[PDB]
Amino acid sequence: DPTVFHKRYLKKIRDLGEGHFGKVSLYCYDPTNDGTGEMVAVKALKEGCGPQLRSGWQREIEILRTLYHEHIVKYKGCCEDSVQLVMEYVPLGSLRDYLPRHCVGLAQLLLFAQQICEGMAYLHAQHYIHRALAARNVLLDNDRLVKIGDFGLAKAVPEGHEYYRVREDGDSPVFWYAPECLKECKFYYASDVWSFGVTLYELLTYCDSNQSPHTKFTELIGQMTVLRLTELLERGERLPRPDRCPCEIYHLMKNCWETEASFRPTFQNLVPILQTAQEKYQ
Numbered sequence: 136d137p138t139v140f141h142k143r144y145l146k147k148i149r150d151l152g153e154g155h156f157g158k159v160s161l162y163c164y165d166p167t168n169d170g171t172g173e174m175v176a177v178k179a180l181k182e183g184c185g186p187q188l189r190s191g192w193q194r195e196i197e198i199l200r201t202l203y204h205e206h207i208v209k210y211k212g213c214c215e216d217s218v219q220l221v222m223e224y225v226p227l228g229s230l231r232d233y234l235p236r237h238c239v240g241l242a243q244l245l246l247f248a249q250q251i252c253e254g255m256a257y258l259h260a261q262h263y264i265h266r267a268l269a270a271r272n273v274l275l276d277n278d279r280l281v282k283i284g285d286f287g288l289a290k291a292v293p294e295g296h297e298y299y300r301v302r303e304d305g306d307s308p309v310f311w312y313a314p315e316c317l318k319e320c321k322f323y324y325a326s327d328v329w330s331f332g333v334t335l336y337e338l339l340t341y342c343d344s345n346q347s348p349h350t351k352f353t354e355l356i357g358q359m360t361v362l363r364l365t366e367l368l369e370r371g372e373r374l375p376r377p378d379r380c381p382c383e384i385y386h387l388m389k390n391c392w393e394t395e396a397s398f399r400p401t402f403q404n405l406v407p408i409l410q411t412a413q414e415k416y417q
């Protein structure tokens with residue numbers, strides 16, 4: 136019943152985001168057509184999705200129902216026709232849209248970075264890999280509260296496996312990807328840590344397009360792109376230290392980007408370090 140949303144009570148307000156396969160929009164859900172209603176975010180598959188995209192969409196909805204964390208977008212229910220995913224409305228939107236138009240100090244960024252690590256440490260503990268950990272998928276509720284907002288590429292990791300074998304896709308976030316994902320198509324929990332390293336780089340660069348990983352890696356050059364990127368990352372080459380980033384944080388990022396996945400810190404490890412770093416800055 137509270138998980139049941141009828142189309143008849145859903146009024147589209149605006150668009151919230153769009154990926155290759157899905158679409159997120161803001162709706163007002165008012166069953167009493169008065170004012171005691173609520174704002175919800177409604178995710179739907181776009182027209183033209185393959186059978187494997189539809190079966191994965193069922194798994195995604197099941198995944199979000201399973202996840203309960205202060206730093207994970209709350210599942211609210213479904214809208215059945217095809218199926219639409221109903222979630223809570225996280226008002227300030229994504230950090231990719233938020234940061235270039237806002238004033239957020241270093242201590243606040245480090246708080247966001249710590250909360251991402253908290254939700255991510257819970258995700259891994261629930262035996263799931265995210266695979267799309269970037270600033271566009273982290274949502275801001277208020278100046279003190281972030282939520283991992285999209286699980287489109289999330290996957291369960293079987294019984295005693297430390298990695299998940301992935302399929303070659305031209306749609307995948309290549310510049311957020313660890314070398315083991317690009318060369319061997321292997322996604323470990325450690326591969327998400329690498330993406331967190333890239334996410335932290337994005338926050339410290341205010342999600343400025345001119346300083347983006349895409350632009351910096353293009354400059355660093357001097358599937359052919361993926362091939363040259365793997366050599367770059369194996370040579371030991373990394374993203375530059377952002378002007379604003381203190382050396383201890385750049386170290387944290389570099390540890391997150393250790394070439395060998397086993398050597399990278401765990402999300403459970405990152406939470407205290409970041410809490411300290413955030414506490415130190417003010």
Ligand SMILES: Nc1n[nH]c2ccc(-c3ccc(NS(=O)(=O)c4cccc(Cl)c4)cc3)cc12
Binds near residue numbers: 151152227271274285
């Ligand atoms: N403001 C919000 N309240 N609740 C939400 C749930 C998801 C989202 C959301 C989450 C992720 C994105 N990033 S995105 O790159 O646009 C994207 C990637 C994959 C699939 C979709 Cl539909 C969108 C954009 C919006 C926003 C809100």
